[PDB]
């Protein structure tokens, strides 16, 4: 380009070529799970009377 | 038959064709516009911080 644009492109480049900063990204996924089933049940069977 | 003005963009050279009064005054006009840019250009680059380019 023209020397006037060359000097303009030279500033654009210098700004655009800036050392891009780095990022360390730690994620922390914590899950906790449990629960209580309970099955208690009573059955009575009698020949004479009847059963449940 | 009077002095005329030109330029080359390969060497970026002013070309005059005419009088020595034209040599005298167009060497002035060479110098008038041979000024460089002062920091701020035609083109800028904005570093956006929270916005995505």
From Swiss-Prot, chain A:
It comes from the Bacteria. It is found in: Cell outer membrane. Belongs to the bacterial secretin family. GSP D subfamily. Forms a cylindrical channel with 15 subunits. The N0, N1, N2 and N3 domains are periplasmic, while the secretin and S domains form a channel that is partially inserted in the outer membrane. The N1, N2 and N3 domains each form a periplasmic ring. The secretin domain forms a double beta-barrel structure; the outer barrel has a diameter of about 110 Angstroms while the inner barrel forms the central gate with a small pore in the closed state. Involved in a type II secretion system (T2SS, formerly general secretion pathway, GSP) for the export of proteins. This subunit forms the outer membrane channel. This is Secretin ExeD. It comes from Aeromonas hydrophila. The chain holds residues 332 to 383 of 678 of the full protein.
UniProtKB/Swiss-Prot annotation, chain B:
It is found in: Cell outer membrane. It comes from the Bacteria. Forms a cylindrical channel with 15 subunits. The N0, N1, N2 and N3 domains are periplasmic, while the secretin and S domains form a channel that is partially inserted in the outer membrane. The N1, N2 and N3 domains each form a periplasmic ring. The secretin domain forms a double beta-barrel structure; the outer barrel has a diameter of about 110 Angstroms while the inner barrel forms the central gate with a small pore in the closed state. Belongs to the bacterial secretin family. GSP D subfamily. Involved in a type II secretion system (T2SS, formerly general secretion pathway, GSP) for the export of proteins. This subunit forms the outer membrane channel. This is Secretin ExeD. It comes from Aeromonas hydrophila. The chain holds residues 227 to 279 of 678 of the full protein.
């Amino acid at each position: 380009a023209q020397p006037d644009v060359m000097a303009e492109l030279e500033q654009v480049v210098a700004k655009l070529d800036i050392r891009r900063a780095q990022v360390l990204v730690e994620a922390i996924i914590v899950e906790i799970a449990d629960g209580d089933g309970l099955n208690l049940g009573v059955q009575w069977a009698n020949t004479n009377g009847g059963g449940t | 038959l009077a002095p005329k003005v030109v330029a080359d963009e390969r060497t970026n050279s002013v070309v005059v064709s005419g009088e020595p009064k034209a040599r005298a005054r167009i060497i002035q006009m060479v110098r008038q516009l041979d000024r460089e840019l002062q920091s701020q250009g035609n083109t800028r680059v904005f570093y956006l911080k929270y916005g995505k380019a």
